[PDB]
Design a protein around this ligand. Structure first.
Ligand SMILES: O=C1CCc2cc(C(=O)N3C[C@H](C(=O)O)CCC34CCCC4)c(F)cc2N1
Length: 167
């Protein structure tokens, strides 16, 4: 039993809700919140910009130190950093950005990072400003993640389409 509330159950391990991931994280304080990161951990917009804003830019400060030490992530890769005031940890995961021409096949590799964590609060990878089809992202999520994932979908119209079209 966990403290996630109001989710629709899609499969044995995947749950979904129309919610602002920032507000969800502040309420639940999950062990892991997933950020929709880029390889530079530049959290300018989308989910990343919103999460970073909620940390008062502390996420960005920590991220800049990480990159200065380690260099960029790989598309499809991840790193674990602090969750600041939002969660114990933030798993920064880089899905392919279609508006940069990146290979959508890397979306499965991106979701594989979730399997290293028993429970996660997460957005749909490569959705929103990353330009992929969110219906496809949900399919890859369900077919790749085996741990317990609670998906927050900001857009109510998109949430209803994802539920109604889910096979
Ligand atoms: O107030 C807020 C704060 C957080 C927020 C995030 C996004 C966003 O970039 N999203 C979420 C979007 C959804 O779940 O509808 C699906 C696509 C992604 C998730 C990961 C890739 C991009 C947005 F469009 C609006 C907001 N509004």
């Amino acid at each position: 039993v966990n403290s996630f509330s109001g989710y629709l159950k899609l499969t044995d391990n995947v749950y979904i809700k129309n919610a602002d991931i920032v507000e969800e994280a502040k309420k639940v304080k999950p062990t892991v919140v997933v950020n929709a990161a880029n390889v530079y951990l530049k959290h300018g917009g989308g989910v990343a910009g919103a999460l970073n804003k909620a940390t008062n830019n502390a996420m960005q400060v920590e991220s800049d130190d990480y990159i200065a030490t380690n260099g960029p992530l790989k598309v499809g890769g991840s790193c674990v950093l602090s969750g600041h005031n939002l969660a114990k940890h933030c798993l920064h995961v880089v899905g392919p950005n279609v508006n940069k021409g990146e290979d959508i096949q890397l979306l499965k590799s991106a979701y594989e990072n979730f399997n290293q964590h028993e429970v996660l609060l997460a957005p749909l990878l490569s959705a929103g400003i990353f330009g992929a089809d969110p219906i496809h992202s949900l399919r890859v999520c369900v077919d790749t993640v085996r741990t317990n994932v609670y998906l927050a979908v900001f857009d109510k119209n998109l949430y209803d389409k994802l539920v109604s079209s889910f096979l």
